Structure formats: C-alpha cells, structure tokens
Amino acid sequence: VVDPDIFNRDPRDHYDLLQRLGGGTYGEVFKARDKVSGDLVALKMVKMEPDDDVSTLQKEILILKTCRHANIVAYHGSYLWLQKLWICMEFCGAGSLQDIYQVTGSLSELQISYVCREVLQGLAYLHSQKKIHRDIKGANILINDAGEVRLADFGISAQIGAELARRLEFIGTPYWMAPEVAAVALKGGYNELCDIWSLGITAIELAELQPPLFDVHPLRVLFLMTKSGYQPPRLKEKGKWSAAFHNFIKVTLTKSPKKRPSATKMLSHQLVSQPGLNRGLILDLLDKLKN
Amino acid sequence: DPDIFNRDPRDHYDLLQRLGGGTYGEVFKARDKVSGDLVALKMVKMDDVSTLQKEILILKTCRHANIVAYHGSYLWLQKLWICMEFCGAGSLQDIYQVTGSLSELQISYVCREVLQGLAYLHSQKKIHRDIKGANILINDAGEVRLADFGISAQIGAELARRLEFIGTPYWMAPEVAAVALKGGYNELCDIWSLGITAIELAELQPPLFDVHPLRVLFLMTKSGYQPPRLKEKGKWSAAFHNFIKVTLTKSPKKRPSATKMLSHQLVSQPGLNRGLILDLLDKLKNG
Ligand SMILES: Cc1c(-c2ccc(N)c(C(=O)N(C)C)c2F)cnc2c1C1(C=N2)CC1
Ligand SMILES: Cc1c(-c2ccc(N)c(C(=O)N(C)C)c2F)cnc2c1C1(C=N2)CC1
C-alpha cells in the first residue's frame, strides 16, 4: 500500500488543471482549481506502472503527511487512479525563492534574516521528528501569496530514507560487523546538522544570487570540502552586511558537525531573533516581484 | 578483462559436484581435463556488471598464499565462470558444525593466517568486510585461505555509482561529501570481524546469534555498547582473552592494524602450523 488514506478516484473530477509549474524542475506539478470551491492546489503526477518500485514515493508522501507545521508545505492527500499517482499539496503562488530573486535581485539583509528564521523553525520541527531535509536551498523554499515561507520537496529525503531502509531490510547477518560499520548502516554517516550548513549556504545564495563556488565542477567541490585545510565560504562584499549576518554565516558554516549549532540554538542567534522580522518583509518582496 | 576466455569452461574442465550447498552461489568442483588438477568454478548468470567486474578485479590482483588463488574467467552464453583454487575441506563453519569447537592452538593458527591475508589485502587498500568462519576456507593440506569478495565488491561498487549520481553539491555540508567519497569506515573493521570469528570458532556461534539482526545493529550503536567476551573464562588462556579484547576495541581510531596484531603473543607463539588443522580434519573424518 502506498498510503492507507489514498483517494481511489481521479482528481480531474474534483479539480480543473490550470497550468504547469516550475518548468518540470520539481516534476510534473500542475496548478489546479477546485470545482465546488475556488481553492487552488498543487498536483504532482507520477506515472505508476506495476513493475516499478514505489518505495521512495511512499516515504516522501509519509514525510509530507506527518508534517503539520506552518513552515512546511501543506499536504492534502494523494489520488490513485488509472496508474497515476497525484500528490495534492498547498499551492505557493510566488514559487521558490530562486524564482523570486532571479527577478528582484538579491534580498535585503532583513528579508534574508526573516527567511532564515522561518526555515530554522521548520528545520527544528523536522529534526525534532528525527527527519532530515538534506536539500535546503533557494529552490526548495517556497513562498505563498500570504507571504509565508514553506519548505518543500522532500524527494532527496525520501531517496536517502528508502535507500538506507533497503540495505537494512536485506542486511543479512551483522553478527560479525564492527560497531562503526553498524552505525553507518543504521545512521548513514552524518546527522541533521547538515541542514544547518545548507541554510548558511542558502543565506549566501539569497544575498548573491549564487551559492559559493557555483562555477566549479561538482566533483571538484566535493574534493575540496574533504581536505584538512578547507575554508568554509563567506559573503563576498563584507561592507554590505552587518556583523550579525557575518557571524550567522560563520557559525552555520562550521566545518565540524560536532560543533555546529542546532536549529533551536540558531533560533537564539542575534540575526534571526531581531524585532524587525515579520511577514511584511516578504509581502514587500512580492510587491517588488509584481513590479 | 582482456585475459577472459571466450569459450565454454567445460572445454577445459569436468564439472564434478556442487559446493557449499549453494551458500556461496553456483560453485562447482571441477577437474582439469588435461592436468587432472582440481579447481572451483563459480557460475554467475549475467544489466549492471560493475559489481561483478569489481569482484574479479579484487581477486585477480591478489597474489598471496592466504587469499584463494585466481586462475581465470570464462564468458560463454550469458554466463561468467570464475575459476579459483579449490579448498577441499570447505570452510571452518562446515568443519566445526561436525567436529565441535576448535582448540585454542587451532584457533590461534587460524587467526595468524587470516591476519597475514588481511595485512596483504589492506596493503592494497582493499577491505574484505565479510570475515567470518564461512569465508575462511581450508584445503586438504590444512592451509588457510580467505574467500568470497562479494560484499567487498558491492561496497566498492555502490560507493562509485553514488559518486556518479551525486547531484549538485554546492549546498552540501562537508561531512556529507566525506561519506560520498570515503564511506564512513576503513579497513580496521576486518580486525573486529576476526575477533568475533575467533569467538565463533571457540563457541560455535558469534555473540548475540539468537538476537534479531536489526536489534543487534541497534545495540551496537547505543553509545554504551560493550565489546563481547569469551563465555568460559577458565577454558582459555590469558593470551586468547587479551587477543579478543584488543581486536574487539570499540573505537576504530584505537583498534590495532593487522600487521600489528601479527606480533601479538597468541599468533606469534611456536607450534602454529597447518598440522593443527590436519588434526582437526582427521577428527572430522574419524570422530
Ligand atoms: C513546485 C511548486 C511550486 C512552484 C515552484 C516554482 C515555480 N516557478 C512555480 C510556478 O510556476 N509559479 C507560477 C508560481 C510553482 F508553482 C509552488 N507550490 C508548490 C510546488 C510543489 C507543492 N507546492 C512542490 C510541488
Ligand atoms: C565455496 C568454496 C569451497 C567450499 C566451501 C564450502 C564447502 N562446504 C565446500 C564443499 O562442498 N566441499 C565438499 C569441500 C567447498 F568446496 C572450496 N573452495 C573454494 C570455494 C570458492 C573458491 N574456492 C569460494 C568459491
């Protein structure tokens, strides 16, 4: 079973499919309008042939289903009919932050600070449920018309969760296994603080329209990060940003995960606990986006 | 593989009987039709072939007395046949399941031979990762050979294919990248596996064998896990208890290497020769 609450009916009987969303970057996601109501929803359709493995699909749905938080994109349910699975989610009218800043340019420090607080609130909830996003970036941070910040796309989170569960289910005999090998089999070799690092990179991305080292080959970036003298990235223009923002970058981009602060600890940081942070900052950004 | 034979292995070999009950796959005892020599032929039905290619590369680049020898590979009719040295007594597990527990001297000799093989493998930057009684083979001469690099090849192939499909790492944390490049552990896991194997040969099971395998994985991570010990304390000498204690060192940063372990009192003691296992095999034949 993909889900004990699947609607075994075609969603086109309840929804008018309006247009495609995100250019396929997030999959086959459509904007859709309810028929008896005006309510708008996002519908992501996945082909479902019988001989396909649906293990990764089932985890993603369960991750989205089990989240009830104001900074995580809302889940409505799933439709299964005629070998098509439609995942029904809240429609975030402004797209991702990457779509936004490609139009408005770099965000103000206050807008970045608001985003970082809202993502940290979502990450704190996720981590408290023993979940790891593992794909925090501008493209996976959606903004709705109400100016709210919602984390989205747990696809990578599902791939990893099903991948580790696959190897565990067919683990065979671990009775001769070494404790560190068993740890990596169960826990995967890292923890939820990888999300804190990704947020730090995302804050730079919102400041500069690019993550650091974006022109470097992917395998060369992985190669540089695994050397003893690795230097965590920094903001380009020092005089453009406050010391609080610089310190926020410095602590979120701590090399050693054993010293990187948690999502909850980071919520007490000077940058994201300042009084001038409110949704008006985002609604102001959407006004600029409307031009 | 450019040295691969493009023919039916039965051109050269007479297939005599299946080996190991299928635990090791489709493995055949075979006689060389001109030499008369005996070999073991593993038949693999051939999709991805990177894991199988890696397992053979690990094997053919091994030239050491304590690693089962590699003779060649036949490719014929979607079947790959890997020709290896035949160990006529099977594995230690096959043996102690009829003879009972090994003597300490026999166990000490076994451990010395495995450490020799492990030290050679690690000097090639290879990790066995599946050391246990079933993978320690014994020939009729009482000599000891490590076998079956199936797990080893899988771990190497999975780590390479994940690097091929990693995505964009610009937002990725460095400890995530280190796992993608180095896996999370090193060759010192084999030393731990040898310690458990030593207990297996002494007590006919590894520790916690009656515990559910997933719970066993869980207990090993509880952050307070304690390394196992030998059950009958007075039955074994202090060198054996200490050998188990140092091979079963929890932290990998402090676990001794194979080469270092080779200078431990238990494996450097005199009288350790294949005659100890010739006695074991004779017990298998008579008792
Ligand atoms: C993908 C997505 C988006 C989205 C993202 C970028 C976009 N550029 C657009 C777009 O095309 N717009 C005209 C706004 C978009 F709709 C908005 N909410 C969503 C989703 C999901 C669930 N809720 C993840 C599947
Ligand atoms: C599997 C194996 C064995 C073996 C192991 C257990 C056994 N129980 C028997 C057996 O059936 N015997 C009648 C002795 C056996 F032949 C002997 N040498 C081998 C192999 C391989 C290459 N060389 C690894 C593939």
XYZ file of C-alpha atoms and ligand atoms in Angstrom:
628
model
C 0.000 0.000 0.000
C 1.264 3.480 -0.938
C -0.892 5.121 1.789
C -3.905 3.953 3.895
C -5.744 7.203 3.066
C -5.365 7.216 -0.735
C -8.323 8.652 -2.622
C -9.109 5.944 -5.198
C -10.589 8.427 -7.661
C -9.364 10.625 -10.489
C -8.563 14.162 -9.261
C -9.785 15.688 -12.546
C -13.352 15.049 -11.344
C -12.759 17.495 -8.468
C -10.089 19.815 -9.920
C -9.571 21.870 -13.067
C -5.912 21.506 -14.036
C -4.754 25.033 -14.912
C -1.076 25.159 -15.870
C 2.289 23.508 -15.370
C 4.503 24.750 -12.551
C 8.235 25.189 -12.082
C 9.256 24.139 -15.591
C 9.499 20.478 -14.591
C 12.286 21.176 -12.078
C 10.024 19.748 -9.360
C 8.450 17.107 -11.602
C 5.065 17.045 -13.320
C 3.395 19.501 -10.950
C 0.245 21.343 -12.027
C -1.650 24.273 -10.584
C -5.264 23.181 -10.121
C -8.556 24.815 -9.132
C -11.248 23.108 -7.074
C -14.620 22.937 -8.799
C -17.086 23.368 -5.943
C -14.689 25.883 -4.320
C -12.125 28.278 -5.721
C -9.315 26.762 -3.627
C -6.038 26.360 -5.505
C -3.770 23.348 -5.039
C -0.567 21.912 -6.472
C -0.929 18.438 -8.018
C 2.207 16.396 -8.748
C 1.518 13.420 -11.029
C 3.808 10.368 -11.030
C 3.439 7.526 -13.531
C 2.706 4.221 -11.762
C 3.473 1.147 -13.805
C 3.068 -2.199 -11.995
C 6.702 -3.331 -12.176
C 8.049 -0.060 -10.730
C 9.317 0.175 -7.163
C 7.300 2.729 -5.184
C 9.408 2.544 -2.012
C 10.879 6.037 -2.411
C 7.489 7.509 -3.369
C 5.846 6.076 -0.258
C 8.419 7.581 2.111
C 8.159 11.075 0.603
C 4.378 11.040 0.990
C 4.676 9.795 4.577
C 7.222 12.535 5.369
C 4.884 15.201 3.961
C 1.831 13.611 5.578
C 3.431 13.507 9.030
C 4.473 17.183 8.989
C 1.997 19.708 10.395
C 3.933 22.945 10.667
C 3.496 26.479 9.380
C 6.902 26.448 7.644
C 6.411 23.105 5.819
C 4.290 22.995 2.665
C 0.816 21.681 3.439
C -0.245 18.198 2.333
C -3.848 17.436 1.386
C -3.734 13.813 0.240
C -2.996 11.527 -2.681
C -5.055 10.260 -5.629
C -4.576 6.858 -7.278
C -6.488 6.121 -10.490
C -5.606 4.595 -13.881
C -1.940 4.019 -12.957
C -1.326 7.659 -11.998
C -0.497 8.930 -8.511
C -1.413 12.565 -7.819
C 0.103 14.117 -4.685
C -2.044 17.082 -3.644
C -0.292 19.934 -1.849
C -0.722 23.590 -0.965
C -0.129 25.931 -3.902
C 2.556 28.541 -3.137
C 1.734 31.339 -5.566
C 5.130 33.056 -5.636
C 7.189 29.951 -6.419
C 10.545 29.342 -4.799
C 12.950 31.999 -3.553
C 15.165 31.183 -6.537
C 12.353 32.138 -8.919
C 11.835 35.316 -6.893
C 15.422 36.595 -6.674
C 16.023 35.907 -10.370
C 13.531 38.780 -10.834
C 14.022 41.079 -7.831
C 17.757 40.665 -7.358
C 19.382 39.979 -4.018
C 17.217 40.149 -0.921
C 17.767 42.687 1.819
C 19.526 41.514 4.963
C 16.228 41.757 6.841
C 14.419 39.613 4.263
C 17.220 37.047 4.390
C 17.028 37.115 8.194
C 13.275 36.510 8.080
C 13.750 33.597 5.664
C 16.460 32.089 7.867
C 14.284 32.291 10.981
C 11.339 30.694 9.173
C 13.450 27.868 7.702
C 15.087 27.284 11.093
C 11.623 26.977 12.636
C 10.791 24.355 10.012
C 14.104 22.533 10.439
C 13.683 22.488 14.231
C 10.304 20.796 13.772
C 11.674 18.339 11.203
C 14.698 17.440 13.339
C 12.512 17.031 16.433
C 10.688 14.344 14.409
C 14.041 12.708 13.533
C 13.718 13.924 9.936
C 16.467 15.471 7.818
C 15.718 17.612 4.786
C 19.159 17.217 3.129
C 18.232 19.532 0.242
C 17.844 23.021 1.756
C 18.327 25.629 -0.975
C 16.538 28.587 -2.521
C 14.652 26.350 -4.967
C 13.180 24.245 -2.130
C 11.965 27.229 -0.089
C 8.530 28.219 -1.379
C 6.608 31.438 -0.737
C 2.814 31.543 -0.929
C 0.603 34.551 -1.636
C 0.116 35.101 2.112
C 3.885 35.776 2.337
C 4.506 32.567 4.258
C 7.726 30.552 3.991
C 7.264 26.802 3.440
C 9.945 24.156 2.992
C 9.204 21.822 0.084
C 10.406 18.852 -1.990
C 11.436 16.008 0.328
C 12.462 13.940 -2.699
C 16.104 13.690 -1.638
C 14.956 12.989 1.926
C 12.846 10.090 0.633
C 15.567 8.705 -1.657
C 18.003 8.552 1.267
C 15.430 7.131 3.688
C 14.329 4.361 1.321
C 17.923 3.683 0.238
C 19.058 3.121 3.825
C 15.934 1.084 4.616
C 16.546 -1.104 1.561
C 20.055 -2.048 2.711
C 18.764 -2.585 6.263
C 15.907 -4.889 5.239
C 18.395 -7.016 3.286
C 21.277 -6.577 5.751
C 21.691 -10.333 6.250
C 23.944 -11.187 9.195
C 25.517 -8.287 11.149
C 26.845 -10.504 13.960
C 30.466 -10.100 12.798
C 30.056 -6.415 11.917
C 32.093 -3.649 13.503
C 30.249 -1.029 15.594
C 31.247 1.862 13.337
C 30.106 -0.131 10.286
C 26.802 -0.771 12.059
C 26.450 2.934 12.885
C 26.948 3.893 9.232
C 24.469 1.195 8.175
C 21.770 2.482 10.544
C 22.568 6.207 10.733
C 24.154 6.856 7.326
C 27.315 8.674 8.446
C 26.002 12.180 9.177
C 23.203 13.872 11.095
C 20.586 16.641 10.864
C 23.169 19.414 11.268
C 23.880 19.086 7.546
C 20.678 21.142 7.194
C 22.180 23.957 9.263
C 25.147 24.128 6.875
C 22.841 24.116 3.855
C 20.904 27.031 5.361
C 24.112 29.047 5.722
C 24.864 28.404 2.059
C 21.275 29.382 1.200
C 21.621 32.700 3.046
C 24.655 33.477 0.883
C 22.658 32.396 -2.172
C 19.870 34.847 -1.319
C 22.498 37.543 -0.782
C 24.428 36.908 -4.000
C 22.052 35.029 -6.394
C 24.504 32.080 -6.398
C 25.901 29.628 -3.883
C 29.671 29.913 -3.415
C 31.886 28.124 -5.953
C 28.923 27.741 -8.347
C 31.236 27.883 -11.383
C 33.356 24.946 -10.167
C 32.865 21.347 -11.294
C 30.708 19.363 -8.813
C 33.352 16.649 -8.293
C 35.965 19.339 -7.601
C 33.730 20.898 -4.927
C 33.265 17.560 -3.151
C 37.033 17.133 -3.470
C 37.842 20.482 -1.831
C 35.402 20.039 1.067
C 37.148 16.837 2.218
C 40.614 18.341 2.819
C 42.034 19.290 6.197
C 42.600 22.950 5.325
C 39.160 23.511 3.803
C 37.924 27.064 4.177
C 34.166 27.462 4.665
C 32.665 30.099 2.360
C 31.952 33.715 3.287
C 29.936 36.626 1.918
C 31.684 38.452 -0.945
C 31.013 42.096 -0.003
C 31.936 42.473 3.670
C 30.746 46.086 3.964
C 27.301 45.224 2.610
C 26.286 43.086 5.608
C 26.187 43.557 9.366
C 28.470 41.756 11.791
C 25.480 39.724 12.976
C 24.966 38.350 9.453
C 28.682 37.595 9.140
C 28.609 35.756 12.459
C 25.471 33.882 11.370
C 27.355 32.705 8.262
C 30.418 31.831 10.344
C 28.541 29.626 12.806
C 26.168 27.907 10.375
C 29.181 27.115 8.159
C 31.152 25.405 10.930
C 33.312 22.661 9.401
C 32.950 20.115 12.185
C 29.360 18.868 12.643
C 30.224 18.140 16.284
C 30.462 21.912 16.903
C 27.780 23.223 14.513
C 24.793 24.675 16.418
C 21.376 23.059 16.151
C 18.293 24.614 14.571
C 16.963 25.515 18.030
C 20.277 27.006 19.153
C 20.412 29.026 15.920
C 16.958 30.452 16.618
C 18.544 32.376 19.504
C 21.113 33.983 17.187
C 21.142 37.781 17.104
C 20.397 37.835 13.373
C 17.141 35.832 13.446
C 15.864 37.000 16.853
C 15.740 40.713 15.975
C 12.391 42.515 16.373
C 12.170 43.910 12.833
C 11.352 40.498 11.360
C 7.770 39.984 10.141
C 5.915 38.707 7.084
C 5.634 42.288 5.831
C 9.230 41.868 4.662
C 8.157 39.019 2.374
C 4.932 40.704 1.264
C 7.147 43.684 0.368
C 9.329 41.329 -1.677
C 6.274 40.002 -3.534
C 5.209 43.584 -4.344
C 8.625 44.147 -5.928
C 8.204 40.796 -7.690
C 4.924 42.058 -9.187
C 6.848 45.164 -10.388
C 39.051 -8.096 -18.792
C 41.282 -8.783 -21.810
C 42.504 -12.120 -20.419
C 38.967 -13.525 -20.430
C 38.475 -16.919 -22.052
C 35.823 -16.765 -24.787
C 34.716 -20.381 -24.624
C 32.773 -22.921 -22.599
C 34.717 -23.833 -19.421
C 33.640 -27.448 -19.909
C 36.029 -27.496 -22.869
C 38.800 -27.487 -20.246
C 37.108 -28.752 -17.074
C 34.955 -31.660 -15.958
C 32.225 -30.462 -13.595
C 32.080 -32.873 -10.656
C 29.727 -31.606 -7.933
C 28.172 -28.514 -6.400
C 29.999 -26.987 -3.444
C 28.961 -25.298 -0.219
C 25.271 -26.157 -0.615
C 24.738 -23.005 -2.673
C 25.643 -20.689 0.216
C 28.455 -19.335 -1.999
C 26.393 -19.294 -5.175
C 26.650 -21.699 -8.083
C 30.115 -23.115 -7.324
C 31.386 -26.350 -8.871
C 34.223 -28.707 -8.089
C 35.926 -29.349 -11.421
C 38.862 -31.375 -12.755
C 41.251 -30.081 -15.415
C 40.749 -32.385 -18.397
C 44.481 -32.393 -19.270
C 46.142 -31.608 -15.918
C 43.864 -33.552 -13.603
C 44.127 -30.587 -11.215
C 41.074 -29.562 -9.200
C 39.535 -26.078 -9.361
C 36.395 -24.353 -8.114
C 34.225 -22.740 -10.795
C 31.610 -20.176 -9.777
C 28.895 -19.639 -12.398
C 27.226 -16.217 -12.485
C 24.157 -15.562 -14.627
C 24.645 -12.283 -16.484
C 22.062 -5.151 -16.678
C 24.762 -3.832 -14.350
C 28.043 -5.759 -14.282
C 30.096 -3.212 -12.310
C 29.869 -5.139 -9.030
C 30.880 -8.430 -10.664
C 33.672 -6.694 -12.594
C 34.977 -5.224 -9.328
C 34.871 -8.573 -7.507
C 37.017 -10.182 -10.199
C 39.482 -7.277 -10.259
C 39.884 -7.553 -6.474
C 40.543 -11.276 -6.930
C 42.983 -11.332 -9.848
C 45.163 -8.563 -8.350
C 45.601 -10.740 -5.228
C 48.736 -12.938 -5.243
C 49.112 -14.159 -1.672
C 49.153 -17.610 -0.111
C 46.280 -16.821 2.283
C 43.911 -15.469 -0.402
C 42.163 -18.032 -2.606
C 44.035 -18.041 -5.896
C 42.541 -16.774 -9.149
C 43.072 -18.738 -12.358
C 40.873 -17.013 -14.938
C 37.377 -16.334 -16.188
C 35.235 -17.849 -18.945
C 32.451 -15.894 -20.660
C 30.006 -18.079 -22.578
C 26.248 -17.956 -23.237
C 25.483 -15.087 -20.825
C 27.430 -16.914 -18.100
C 30.633 -15.760 -16.429
C 32.680 -18.553 -14.842
C 35.313 -17.543 -12.287
C 37.978 -20.224 -11.851
C 39.607 -20.342 -8.422
C 41.654 -22.563 -6.150
C 39.702 -25.460 -4.616
C 39.825 -25.825 -0.826
C 38.846 -29.463 -0.342
C 37.766 -29.194 3.307
C 35.278 -26.359 2.834
C 35.051 -23.606 5.427
C 35.656 -23.642 9.168
C 31.899 -23.410 9.752
C 31.337 -26.624 7.793
C 34.059 -28.182 9.961
C 33.104 -27.073 13.475
C 29.475 -27.978 12.744
C 30.663 -31.613 12.856
C 33.842 -31.551 14.970
C 32.696 -29.063 17.605
C 34.698 -26.179 18.990
C 38.281 -25.728 17.841
C 41.191 -25.912 20.240
C 42.894 -22.634 21.122
C 46.041 -23.660 19.229
C 43.970 -24.365 16.115
C 42.185 -21.033 16.599
C 45.498 -19.228 17.132
C 46.889 -20.701 13.905
C 43.715 -19.743 12.024
C 43.957 -16.177 13.315
C 47.612 -15.836 12.271
C 46.859 -16.972 8.707
C 43.858 -14.637 8.355
C 45.896 -11.692 9.661
C 48.522 -12.463 7.017
C 45.816 -12.327 4.357
C 44.246 -9.204 5.850
C 47.612 -7.408 6.059
C 48.182 -8.140 2.363
C 44.665 -7.001 1.412
C 44.989 -3.780 3.407
C 48.396 -3.091 1.854
C 46.456 -2.999 -1.435
C 43.858 -0.614 0.062
C 41.298 -3.424 -0.093
C 38.752 -4.162 2.627
C 37.305 -7.648 2.976
C 34.304 -6.586 5.145
C 32.891 -10.152 5.429
C 35.333 -12.015 7.676
C 33.631 -14.989 9.352
C 34.069 -18.737 9.631
C 32.157 -19.409 6.426
C 34.633 -17.292 4.425
C 37.784 -18.851 5.914
C 38.418 -21.868 3.681
C 40.654 -24.852 4.426
C 42.306 -27.149 1.918
C 43.198 -30.798 2.467
C 46.743 -29.727 3.355
C 45.380 -27.787 6.333
C 46.248 -24.428 4.780
C 44.024 -21.375 5.269
C 42.582 -19.106 2.568
C 40.265 -16.102 2.704
C 37.487 -16.266 0.125
C 34.359 -14.617 -1.302
C 34.800 -10.900 -2.014
C 31.103 -10.465 -2.820
C 30.347 -7.951 -0.068
C 33.664 -6.155 -0.650
C 32.870 -5.635 -4.333
C 29.332 -4.425 -3.567
C 30.526 -1.751 -1.135
C 33.119 -0.578 -3.651
C 30.593 -0.531 -6.499
C 27.884 1.285 -4.520
C 30.330 3.997 -3.431
C 31.470 4.586 -7.019
C 27.975 4.650 -8.526
C 26.727 7.102 -5.887
C 29.586 9.433 -6.821
C 28.415 9.179 -10.437
C 24.883 10.269 -9.386
C 25.526 12.697 -6.525
C 23.823 15.768 -7.997
C 24.887 19.329 -7.311
C 26.911 19.625 -4.072
C 27.061 23.428 -3.725
C 24.687 23.443 -0.733
C 26.059 20.194 0.669
C 27.788 20.007 4.043
C 31.376 18.675 4.082
C 30.625 15.633 6.261
C 28.007 14.671 3.675
C 30.671 14.894 0.967
C 33.154 12.831 3.000
C 30.643 9.972 3.245
C 30.124 10.206 -0.515
C 33.871 9.821 -1.119
C 35.003 7.555 1.751
C 32.016 5.592 3.022
C 32.374 6.159 6.781
C 34.804 3.430 7.948
C 38.129 1.850 6.988
C 39.966 -1.472 6.835
C 40.113 -1.853 10.637
C 36.593 -3.306 10.569
C 38.148 -6.600 9.422
C 40.148 -6.764 12.677
C 36.911 -6.602 14.669
C 35.393 -9.278 12.422
C 38.376 -11.533 13.140
C 37.840 -11.214 16.894
C 34.189 -12.235 16.564
C 35.287 -15.104 14.303
C 37.751 -16.258 16.970
C 34.855 -16.460 19.449
C 32.758 -18.190 16.774
C 35.388 -20.922 16.398
C 35.532 -21.287 20.196
C 31.791 -21.275 20.962
C 30.228 -22.440 17.622
C 28.255 -19.165 17.272
C 29.092 -15.460 17.143
C 27.904 -13.339 20.082
C 24.209 -12.451 20.080
C 23.436 -15.012 17.354
C 19.981 -15.638 18.864
C 19.186 -11.882 18.827
C 17.254 -10.404 15.911
C 19.777 -8.949 13.415
C 18.215 -5.468 13.390
C 18.249 -5.310 17.193
C 21.909 -6.366 17.052
C 22.629 -3.376 14.811
C 20.757 -1.189 17.290
C 22.629 -2.376 20.390
C 25.963 -1.726 18.646
C 25.061 1.979 18.312
C 23.500 2.668 21.744
C 26.664 4.697 22.572
C 27.208 2.440 25.604
C 27.719 -0.849 23.780
C 30.298 -3.165 25.348
C 32.519 -5.490 23.272
C 31.716 -9.184 23.757
C 33.919 -11.682 25.548
C 34.550 -15.410 25.706
C 31.895 -17.209 27.735
C 34.044 -19.814 29.536
C 36.760 -17.712 31.152
C 38.846 -20.547 32.621
C 38.801 -22.659 29.456
C 41.046 -20.213 27.573
C 44.466 -18.715 28.275
C 45.108 -15.049 29.049
C 46.702 -14.524 25.629
C 43.427 -15.539 23.953
C 41.312 -13.328 26.231
C 43.660 -10.410 25.563
C 43.672 -11.070 21.812
C 39.868 -10.901 21.832
C 39.998 -7.742 23.932
C 42.293 -5.823 21.578
C 40.731 -6.985 18.295
C 37.319 -6.006 19.716
C 38.351 -2.430 20.544
C 35.241 -0.298 20.077
C 36.785 2.874 18.672
C 38.320 2.264 15.216
C 40.900 5.000 15.851
C 42.399 2.786 18.591
C 41.904 -0.682 17.051
C 45.251 -2.294 16.128
C 46.076 -2.979 12.498
C 46.516 -6.459 11.036
C 50.299 -6.044 10.837
C 50.475 -5.017 14.495
C 48.204 -7.901 15.548
C 50.575 -10.315 13.779
C 53.077 -9.590 16.587
C 50.593 -10.496 19.341
C 51.556 -13.304 21.704
C 48.696 -15.559 20.603
C 49.635 -15.661 16.900
C 53.436 -15.463 17.274
C 53.655 -18.465 19.622
C 55.530 -21.568 18.416
C 53.990 -24.705 17.009
C 51.456 -22.834 14.869
C 51.447 -24.782 11.618
C 48.967 -26.456 9.285
C 49.401 -29.661 11.299
C 46.972 -28.253 13.858
C 44.264 -28.249 11.186
C 45.366 -31.659 9.876
C 44.448 -32.883 13.358
C 41.089 -31.096 13.081
C 40.331 -32.653 9.685
C 41.265 -36.101 10.973
C 38.795 -35.600 13.821
C 36.244 -34.668 11.143
C 36.986 -37.945 9.354
C 37.020 -40.220 12.425
C 35.107 -38.754 15.400
C 6.733 23.341 -7.434
C 5.755 24.042 -6.518
C 5.504 25.424 -6.678
C 6.176 26.268 -7.711
C 7.571 26.446 -7.674
C 8.232 27.213 -8.605
C 7.504 27.866 -9.586
N 8.143 28.655 -10.532
C 6.108 27.729 -9.627
C 5.353 28.424 -10.679
O 5.425 28.009 -11.818
N 4.586 29.500 -10.393
C 3.844 30.155 -11.473
C 4.476 30.032 -9.031
C 5.447 26.928 -8.691
F 4.105 26.817 -8.750
C 4.594 26.036 -5.819
N 3.980 25.357 -4.880
C 4.184 24.056 -4.694
C 5.076 23.358 -5.507
C 5.083 21.921 -5.009
C 3.999 21.857 -3.934
N 3.605 23.246 -3.731
C 6.395 21.189 -4.757
C 5.428 20.682 -5.836
C 32.957 -22.315 -1.795
C 34.356 -22.857 -1.975
C 34.747 -24.064 -1.355
C 33.821 -24.852 -0.482
C 33.273 -24.262 0.664
C 32.410 -24.945 1.488
C 32.100 -26.266 1.216
N 31.237 -26.950 2.058
C 32.663 -26.899 0.091
C 32.316 -28.300 -0.222
O 31.195 -28.512 -0.621
N 33.174 -29.338 -0.115
C 32.729 -30.690 -0.468
C 34.548 -29.158 0.354
C 33.514 -26.183 -0.758
F 34.045 -26.801 -1.828
C 36.053 -24.518 -1.567
N 36.893 -23.841 -2.317
C 36.557 -22.700 -2.913
C 35.273 -22.170 -2.763
C 35.245 -20.866 -3.556
C 36.535 -20.888 -4.380
N 37.355 -21.901 -3.719
C 34.818 -19.573 -2.868
C 34.024 -20.102 -4.067
